[PDB]
């Protein structure tokens, strides 16, 4: 069986290794516009912030490793087209513009995504960088040497990380986005208000509710004009989302409005021999049980695995995702999973939430820390619809506990009393997650009288 892989960062890497372990009698050929694989862009910000001392340690594999098991790995190759009918791909070597067309028995679309770039005059400016791959990274390190004033466009995870990183390293940092509050897509106001006061306490300038219009690169730097003001920075970084790199298959496979490849529960697109995984596909979102586009490295490794398991026939079903996510900002651990209250009612769902703030362990310990918590739930079925935790004590593991509850369709009543260890070194007699759910019950008890 001849198998070809389009794109190879994380989704393609795991699929490659998986397909060769499950079907060693296969001829696997992978193409990638780049030269490397398995680069952890998730760790770029840490690298810029000075938290990474060896950059090659951000690669958990290499073209050599994949080709040691039998992978026909063609780096520097740009797949130019795929015809689902003749089952061939047209690729062009980037080292000499050599075009070729090969047939295949199965094709895996792991082409991922690409940053979203608006149609804003002045975009063409070189002082406006993108942030996605190891090439953008290596550019930022140097170009962040003589760029004292740096500006980030967007208000997502990347923008938050980049801003903090450049802020704790002696830069005049500015952050701009149409969002009303930072990281609105992941946390509710009570959380994002604390982060902004942090961003302000650390000198970062916040220009929210404003959308850029142009970029007039002067001899004094890059001049950004938003529809409410203008700012003068030395470098601007685009951090305003991802869009699936699904041009080759547009109109050729069922997609979402953004170009995300719809799939069944075994990673098969509408073309029964074309698979997708990662930033190029749409994941089943359990909180809504409807497909969604949530580009996360977690979906790329899992989806990449299932492809190998299901290449020849259906074997293991995708478990969907709660979109569990989190990060560290100014020593605070900020994690969440599932729906935010805003994102649930914005979809008209029957949703309520509780925001609890309790110390994570008894006050008699030598030290303790406040943990701000949120629980989104159905007021009728009592089904948990998501949660979030913020604390200088690493509460990140709790978000994965909430993820399990959502995966298992658990209610606030389940979480209110589910067994959880107790030890003053760790929590109160009731783990802070139990207490959180018991507030949901108390909330619903108030409404039942």
Q: Does 304 help bind ligand NDP (rule: CB under 6 A)?
A: no
Q: What residues contact 428, with CB distance under 8 A and at least 6 apart?
A: 358, 359, 361, 362, 422, 435
Contact mark string toward its own copies, 251..280, x via CB under 8 A: -----xxx----------------------
CB-nearer residue toward its own copies: 4 or 337:
337
Rg (CA), the chain: 23
Tell me the torsion sign for CA atoms 376, 378, 379, 384. negative
Let me know if 42 is a catalytic residue.
Answer: yes
Distance from chain centroid for Cα 26: 32
**Tokens standing for residue 196:** 């902004």
Q: Please spell the DSSP secondary structure of 40-70, one letter per residue.
A: -GGGHHHHHTT--S-GGGGBS--HHHHHTTT
Q: Which of 185, 252, 317, 345 binds ligand NDP (CB under 6 A)?
A: 185
Secondary structure letter of residue 126 according to DSSP = T
Residue from 376, 373, 422 nearest 393 by CA: 373
Is there binding between residue 278 and ligand FAD (CB under 6 A)? yes
239 is annotated as an active-site residue: no
Residue 110 binds ligand FAD, judged by CB under 6 A: yes
Q: Structure tokens of 191?
A: 């959380």
Taking residues 162 to 201 in sequence order and writing x for each that binds Cl ion by CB under 5 A, - otherwise, the string is ---------------------------x------------
Neighbours of 431 (CB within 10 A): 21
Residue from 46, 256, 262, 296 in contact with ligand FAD (CB under 6 A): 296
Residue 33 beta carbon to ligand FAD: minimum distance, rounded to whole angstroms: 4
449 lines the binding site for ligand NDP (CB under 6 A) = no
Q: Which of 7, 63, 154, 386 binds ligand NDP (CB under 6 A)?
A: 154
Site track for ligand FAD across 8-47, x = CB under 6 A: -xxxx------------------xxxx------xx-x---
Torsion 116-113-100-69 (CA) sign: positive
What distance in Å separates the CA atoms of residue 155 and residue 144, rounded to the nearest whole number? 20
Which residue in the list 10, 77, 171, 382 is annotated as catalytic? 10
Instruction: Return the residues of window 88-147 that contact its own copies according to CB under 8 A.
Output: 119
Residue nearest to ligand FAD (CB): 278
Q: Is 118 in the site for ligand NDP (CB under 6 A)?
A: yes
Does residue 396 contact residue 418 with C-beta atoms inside 8 Å?
Answer: no
Q: Which of residues 18, 74, 111, 322 is near ligand FAD by CB under 6 A? A: 111
φ/ψ (deg, to 5) at 21? -80, -30
Q: Name the residue with tokens 């019950």.
A: 441
Please choose which of Cl ion, ligand FAD, its own copies, none residue 321 contacts, taking the beta carbon within 5 to 8 angstroms, the exact cut-off set by kind: its own copies
Residue 189 binding: pick among ligand NDP, Cl ion, ligand FAD, none (C-beta 5-8 Å cut-off by kind):
Cl ion
Question: Which residues are known to be catalytic?
Answer: 10, 42
């Amino acid at each position: 069986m001849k198998v070809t892989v389009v794109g190879c960062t994380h989704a393609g890497t795991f699929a490659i290794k998986q397909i060769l372990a499950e079907h060693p009698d296969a001829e696997v050929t992978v193409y990638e516009r780049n030269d490397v694989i398995s680069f952890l862009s998730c760790g770029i910000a840490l690298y810029l912030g000075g938290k990474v001392a060896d950059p090659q340690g951000l690669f958990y594999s290499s073209p050599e490793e994949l080709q040691k098991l039998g992978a026909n790995v063609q780096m520097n190759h740009n797949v130019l087209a795929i015809d689902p009918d003749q089952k061939t791909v047209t690729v062009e070597d980037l080292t000499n513009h050599a075009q070729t067309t090969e047939s295949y028995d199965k094709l895996v679309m792991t082409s991922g995504s690409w940053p979203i770039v608006p149609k804003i005059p002045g975009i063409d400016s070189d002082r406006v960088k993108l942030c996605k791959n190891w090439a953008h990274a290596q550019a930022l390190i140097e170009d962040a040497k003589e760029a004292k004033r740096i500006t980030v466009i967007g208000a997502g995870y990347i923008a938050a990380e980049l801003a903090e990183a450049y802020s704790t390293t002696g830069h005049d940092v500015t952050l701009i986005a149409r969002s009303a509050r930072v990281m609105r897509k992941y946390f509710d106001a009570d959380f994002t208000d604390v982060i902004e006061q942090d961003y302000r306490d650390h000198g970062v300038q916040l220009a929210l509710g404003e959308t850029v219009e142009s970029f007039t690169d002067s001899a004094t730097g890059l001049t950004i004009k938003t529809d409410k003001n203008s700012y003068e920075t030395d470098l601007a970084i685009l951090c305003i989302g991802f869009r699936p790199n699904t041009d080759l298959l547009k109109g050729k496979v069922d997609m979402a409005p953004n170009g995300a490849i719809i799939t069944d529960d075994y990673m098969r697109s509408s073309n029964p021999d074309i698979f997708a995984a990662g930033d190029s596909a749409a994941v089943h979102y359990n909180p809504t049980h409807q497909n969604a586009y949530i580009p996360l490295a977690t979906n790329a490794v899992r989806q990449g695995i299932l492809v190998g398991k299901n290449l020849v026939k259906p074997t293991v079903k995708y478990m969907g995702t709660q979109s569990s996510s989190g990060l560290a900002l100014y020593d605070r651990t900020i994690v969440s999973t599932g729906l935010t209250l805003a994102a649930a009612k914005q979809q008209g769902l029957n949703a309520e939430q509780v925001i609890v703030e309790d110390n994570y362990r008894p006050e008699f310990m030598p030290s303790t820390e406040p943990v701000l918590m949120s629980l989104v739930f159905d007021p009728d079925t009592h089904r948990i619809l998501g949660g979030a935790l913020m604390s200088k004590y690493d509460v990140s593991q709790s978000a994965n506990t909430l993820s399990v509850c959502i995966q298992n369709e658990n209610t606030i009543d389940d979480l209110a009393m589910v067994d959880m260890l107790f030890q003053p070194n760790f929590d109160r007699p009731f783990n802070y997650l139990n207490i959180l759910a018991q507030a949901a019950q108390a909330k619903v008890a108030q409404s039942v009288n």
